[PDB]
Design a protein around this ligand. Sequence first.
Ligand SMILES: Nc1nc2c(ncn2[C@@H]2O[C@H](COP(=O)(O)OP(=O)(O)OC[C@@H](O)C(=O)O)[C@@H](O)[C@H]2O)c(=O)[nH]1
Ligand SMILES: [Cl-]
Ligand SMILES: [Mg+2]
Ligand SMILES: [Mg+2]
Length: 203
Amino acid sequence: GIWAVVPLKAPECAKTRLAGVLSHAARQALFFSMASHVIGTLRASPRIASLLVVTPSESTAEMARAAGAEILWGPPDEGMANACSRAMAHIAAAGGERVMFVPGDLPLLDEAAIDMLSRAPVDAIGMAPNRDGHGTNGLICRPGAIPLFFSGPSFSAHQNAARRAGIDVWVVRSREWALDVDLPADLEEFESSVRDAKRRVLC
Ligand SMILES: Nc1nc2c(ncn2[C@@H]2O[C@H](COP(=O)(O)OP(=O)(O)OC[C@@H](O)C(=O)O)[C@@H](O)[C@H]2O)c(=O)[nH]1
Ligand SMILES: [Cl-]
Ligand SMILES: [Mg+2]
Ligand SMILES: [Mg+2]
């Protein structure tokens, strides 16, 4: 009985840390591409009972419904932590057993990745770090086990929240969880695994 929660911005103010290397339109294109991939991946997962997108944008909300998500309104520019917290409280009020927070910028995410994080015991915090190992690209818990600390040194914050509460932690590290696209270096790493995949799978 896992609810998946994908927080998503307005497309006109998405991936601001790529504004040096992509145009306004190139950032919208990458934002939508990655988000319907994340949403579509969770939607096809036999492990995801329900799928909620949190967004302030009619544009984002229509794309998300079309990909099969239910929609929760959030105000703009509150950050991932408060958008996920809003959803967690709605899901908790509504009887939700477990919730998995997944950002919309994981272009390599697969069924294998969802399955592994969903195999954390119900009474633990499941936690998937980013490539530099300071951030959090997935967390699954009982609604209300810890408060949320997404963005910045989030991995540290989550681990410390679990320690304080004496709650077990299951860390899941993989190529597919770790690469979120925020920075130019991140986009190039994405581009580079997509060329590897032409060669390995095709030629
Ligand atoms: N509804 C709502 N959605 C938002 C908002 N702010 C951003 N998001 C979404 O939260 C997700 C991650 O934003 P991003 O800039 O990639 O965060 P990042 O630095 O990688 O760190 C987050 C997490 O991965 C971590 O490492 O702790 C994306 O799907 C954003 O669109 C917002 O105020 N409202
Ligand atoms: Cl974004
Ligand atoms: Mg990110
Ligand atoms: Mg990140």
